Design a protein around this ligand. Structure first.
Ligand code: 63K
Length: 240
C-alpha cells in the first residue's frame, strides 16, 4: 500500500527531465518497480521512478546502446577500450548474479553507454528467443540460468572484439543448435587477444557448472585489461 511510495514520482519512450531521462509508457506494476528499484550498481541500468499513464522513468544514456557505439565507423576503440566495456558488463552481471537475477537476454544491443562511457547492463525489469546468444542446454530446455547468462556474456565479448559483428552470420537461427552440436564455437576475432579467447571458450563450456562465475570473469578480465595501454586500434572485418 505505502510500500511503493519511495518508487513513485509526480511533477514507447520519450525524453524527460528529473536529470535527463527516458520516459516509457496495476498491483504487478507496483511490486515490480519496488523489486527493480532495489537494484543499484554502476554497471546496471537504474530505475529512477514510476508514474498515472503509466510511466517508467530511466536514466537517459548519452551514447545509446553498446552494439551501435562499437559499430560506428567514426569511433576508434582500442583493444583496451573494448576489453574495458567487457569488464564493465562482467561487473554488472556479477551484481545481478548476486541478486539471483537471471538476465536471459544479455547481448551488446542490451547494454548502454552514459556520458562518462560507463556501460550499464539494461533490458531487464520494467525497462524490458535470442538463439545466437543462448547456451546449448537453454536451446534444448528453454530454461535459463546464471551459467547460461555466462555463455551469452562470452558471445557479448565476441561482439565486443569484432566491433558489433553478428554472431554466426552464415548460420540461420533455426539451425544454430545442430551447428553447435557438431563441435563448433565462434572463431577468434582478429583483434581478440589469445587470453580473452580462452575466456570466451571457458564461458562456452559444454557443462554449465564448469563455466566460470561472473566473479571469476571480473577478476580474470580485470587482469588481462591491465596489460593493455590503448595502443591497438580495432578495425572492422570485411566479411561481417
Ligand atoms: O538513445 C540514446 N542515446 C542516443 C545515442 N545516439 C546514437 C545515435 O548517434 C547519436 C547518439 N540514449 C538512450 N537512453 C535510453 C535509456 C532507456 C531507454 S528505454 C530502455 N530500457 N532498457 C533498454 C535497453 C536497450 C534499449 C535500447 C536498445 C537499442 C537502442 F538503439 C536504444 C535503446 N533501450 N532500453 C532508451 C534509451 S535511448
Amino acid at each position: 500500500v505505502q510500500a511503493v511510495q519511495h518508487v513513485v514520482i509526480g511533477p514507447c519512450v520519450y525524453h524527460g527531465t528529473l536529470i535527463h531521462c527516458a520516459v516509457k509508457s496495476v498491483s504487478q506494476f507496483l511490486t515490480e518497480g519496488i523489486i527493480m528499484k532495489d537494484f543499484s550498481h554502476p554497471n546496471v541500468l537504474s530505475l529512477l521512478g514510476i508514474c498515472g499513464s503509466p510511466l517508467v522513468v530511466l536514466p537517459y544514456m548519452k551514447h545509446g546502446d553498446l552494439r551501435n557505439f562499437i559499430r560506428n565507423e567514426t569511433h576508434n576503440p582500442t583493444v583496451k577500450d573494448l576489453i574495458g566495456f567487457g569488464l564493465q558488463v562482467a561487473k554488472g552481471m556479477k551484481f545481478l548474479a548476486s541478486k539471483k537475477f537471471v538476465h536471459r537476454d544479455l547481448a551488446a544491443r542490451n547494454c548502454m553507454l552514459d556520458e562518462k562511457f560507463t556501460v550499464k547492463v539494461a533490458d531487464f525489469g520494467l525497462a524490458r528467443l535470442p538463439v545466437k546468444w543462448m547456451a546449448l542446454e537453454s536451446l534444448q530446455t528453454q530454461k535459463f540460468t546464471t551459467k547460461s547468462d555466462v555463455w551469452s556474456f562470452g558471445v557479448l565479448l565476441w561482439e565486443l572484439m569484432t566491433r558489433g559483428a553478428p554472431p554466426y552470420p552464415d548460420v540461420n537461427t533455426f539451425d544454430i543448435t545442430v551447428y553447435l552440436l557438431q563441435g563448433r564455437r565462434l572463431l577468434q576475432p582478429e583483434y581478440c587477444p589469445d587470453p580473452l579467447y580462452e575466456v570466451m571458450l571457458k564461458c562456452w563450456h559444454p557443462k554449465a557448472e564448469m563455466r566460470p562465475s561472473f566473479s571469476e570473469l571480473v577478476s580474470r578480465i580485470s587482469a588481462i585489461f591491465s596489460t593493455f595501454i590503448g595502443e591497438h586500434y580495432v578495425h572492422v572485418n570485411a566479411t561481417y
